Design an enzyme around this catalytic site. Structure first.
Site, PDB file in Angstrom:
ATOM      1  N   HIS A 184      -6.506   5.791  64.674  1.00 38.57           N
ATOM      2  CA  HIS A 184      -5.327   5.176  64.084  1.00 38.57           C
ATOM      3  C   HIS A 184      -4.747   4.117  65.018  1.00 38.57           C
ATOM      4  O   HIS A 184      -3.921   3.315  64.576  1.00 38.57           O
ATOM      5  CB  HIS A 184      -4.273   6.189  63.685  1.00 38.57           C
ATOM      6  CG  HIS A 184      -3.363   6.707  64.752  1.00 38.57           C
ATOM      7  ND1 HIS A 184      -3.596   7.925  65.350  1.00 38.57           N
ATOM      8  CD2 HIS A 184      -2.232   6.217  65.311  1.00 38.57           C
ATOM      9  CE1 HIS A 184      -2.633   8.146  66.247  1.00 38.57           C
ATOM     10  NE2 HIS A 184      -1.788   7.118  66.248  1.00 38.57           N
TER      11      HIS A 184
ATOM     12  N   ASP B 226      -9.456  11.787  63.552  1.00 37.00           N
ATOM     13  CA  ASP B 226      -8.771  10.647  64.172  1.00 37.00           C
ATOM     14  C   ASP B 226      -9.355  10.329  65.541  1.00 37.00           C
ATOM     15  O   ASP B 226      -8.791  10.765  66.565  1.00 37.00           O
ATOM     16  CB  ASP B 226      -7.283  10.976  64.272  1.00 37.00           C
ATOM     17  CG  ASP B 226      -6.409   9.780  64.614  1.00 37.00           C
ATOM     18  OD1 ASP B 226      -6.940   8.657  64.623  1.00 37.00           O
ATOM     19  OD2 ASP B 226      -5.222  10.028  64.829  1.00 37.00           O
TER      20      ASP B 226
ATOM     21  N   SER C 276      -0.005   7.881  71.219  1.00 40.94           N
ATOM     22  CA  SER C 276      -1.203   7.873  70.388  1.00 40.94           C
ATOM     23  C   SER C 276      -2.466   7.522  71.142  1.00 40.94           C
ATOM     24  O   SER C 276      -2.431   6.540  71.892  1.00 40.94           O
ATOM     25  CB  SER C 276      -1.103   6.810  69.262  1.00 40.94           C
ATOM     26  OG  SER C 276      -0.125   7.201  68.288  1.00 40.94           O
TER      27      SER C 276
END
Ligand SMILES: CC(C)C[C@@H](N)C(=O)N1CCC[C@H]1C(=O)NCc1cccc(Cl)c1
Ligand code: NA
Ligand code: NA
Lengths: 249, 9, 27
Positions: free
Chosen positions: A43, A99, A196
Site C-alpha cells: 500500500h 500487503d 506503513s
C-alpha cells in the site's frame, strides 16, 4: 509511532525510509533484507483509493538513518530503485490482504555499523514466536499521534486472533496478525501514519538473531483503546518472496 | 521540513 | 548468513535498553 521512544543509535540497522523525490517527503517505512532487496507494504506503492501508484523513478531508499528530516552525511546511504514487485493478489480494494512488496536496488548497499539486514523467519521460528502475548518491536518516523525528530521504537504484544477479529468490522485473514495492548493492560502504543511498510521484529531466544515477522499494514486510527494495529504476516508470504528473489536476483 | 539531499541522487 | 546481528549490539555483546522486555514475554 504513538507512545514509543527514541531509538538508540544502530538499534534498527535494517530500517529503511521510503522517500518521495519531489516534493521531497517521507512516504513510508521499509526494511533491508539483503544488500540489494528492500521489503515494504504494497500500500506504500499502490493504493488507488488515494490515487497512489508510484513507479521506480518516483522514489528513493534511504538506509542507515536516525534523524527523520536531517541529511545524515557519512552515515546514511541513498539508493535508487531498479524494480518494484507487488504481490499479485494484494487486496487494496477491501482489507489490504497480502500487503507486501519487494524493491530491488540499482546497486548493492555497503553494510556498516548503521546498515545491516534483518532475517526473514523460517517456519520453525514463526511457529515458536508468533504467539499471543509474545512481544515484537515496531519502528518508524511516522506520526506521534492520530512528527518525531528521530526514529521511534515501540514494543507491542501479539494479540489473540479472536480479539483481533472482535475489535473491527474489517475481515481479517490468515495473512495478517494484530498487536498492541488491551485497555485493561495499562501500557499503550501503536504504529501510525507514515510507519506503513516498516518492520515488526522479534529477537529469537534460540539464536539471538532479529527476525522480521510483520510489516506495518493497517489500523483504524492510531493507539485507540480497544483497537489494534495489523501487520502483514511475513512467514505466510515467504514463498512469494523467495520466488521473486530467486527469479529476479 | 526535509533537508535537501545531494543533487547526485 | 549474518542477518539479524546488529554491529553495535549483538556483534559487541551489548544489549539495547528494552530488548529484555521482548525476551521476558517469550514464556
Ligand atoms: C484496511 C484499511 C483500508 C484501513 C485503513 N484505515 C488503513 O489503515 N490504511 C488505508 C491505506 C493505508 C492504511 C494505513 O493507514 N496504514 C497505516 C497504519 C496506521 C495505524 C496502524 C497501522 Cl499497523 C498502520
Ligand atoms: Na469483527
Ligand atoms: Na489500541
Amino acid at each position: 509511532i504513538v507512545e514509543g521512544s527514541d531509538a538508540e543509535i544502530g538499534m534498527s540497522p535494517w530500517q529503511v525510509m521510503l522517500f518521495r523525490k519531489s516534493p521531497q517527503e517521507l512516504l513510508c517505512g521499509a526494511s533491508l533484507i539483503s544488500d540489494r532487496w528492500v521489503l515494504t507494504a504494497a500500500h506504500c506503492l499502490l493504493y488507488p483509493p488515494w490515487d497512489k501508484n508510484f513507479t521506480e523513478n518516483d522514489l528513493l531508499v534511504r538506509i542507515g538513518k536516525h534523524s527523520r528530516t536531517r541529511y545524515e552525511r557519512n552515515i546514511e546511504k541513498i539508493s535508487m530503485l531498479e524494480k518494484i514487485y507487488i504481490h499479485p493478489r494484494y487486496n487494496w480494494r477491501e482489507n489490504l490482504d497480502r500487503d507486501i512488496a519487494l524493491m530491488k536496488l540499482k546497486k548493492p548497499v555497503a553494510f556498516s555499523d548503521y546498515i545491516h539486514p534483518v532475517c526473514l523467519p523460517d517456519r520453525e521460528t514463526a511457529a515458536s514466536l508468533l504467539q499471543a502475548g509474545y512481544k515484537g518491536r515496531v519502528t518508524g518516523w511516522g506520526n506521534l499521534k492520530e512528527q518525531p525528530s528521530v526514529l521511534q521504537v515501540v514494543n507491542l504484544p501479539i494479540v489473540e486472533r479472536p480479539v483481533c477479529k472482535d475489535s473491527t468490522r474489517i475481515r481479517i485473514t490468515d495473512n495478517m496478525f494484530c498487536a498492541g495492548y488491551k485497555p485493561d493492560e495499562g501500557k499503550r502504543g501503536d504504529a501510525c501514519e507514515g510507519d506503513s511498510g516498516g518492520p515488526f521484529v522479534m529477537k529469537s531466544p534460540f539464536n539471538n538473531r532479529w527476525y522480521q515477522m510483520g510489516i506495518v499494514s493497517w489500523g483504524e486510527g492510531c493507539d485507540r483503546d480497544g483497537k489494534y494495529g495489523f501487520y502483514t504476516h511475513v512467514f505466510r508470504l515467504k514463498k512469494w518472496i523467495q520466488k521473486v528473489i530467486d527469479q529476479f536476483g | 521540513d526535509f533537508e535537501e539531499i545531494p543533487e547526485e541522487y | 548468513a549474518d542477518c539479524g546481528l546488529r554491529p553495535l549490539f549483538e556483534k559487541k555483546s551489548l544489549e539495547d535498553k528494552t530488548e529484555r522486555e521482548l525476551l521476558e514475554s517469550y514464556i
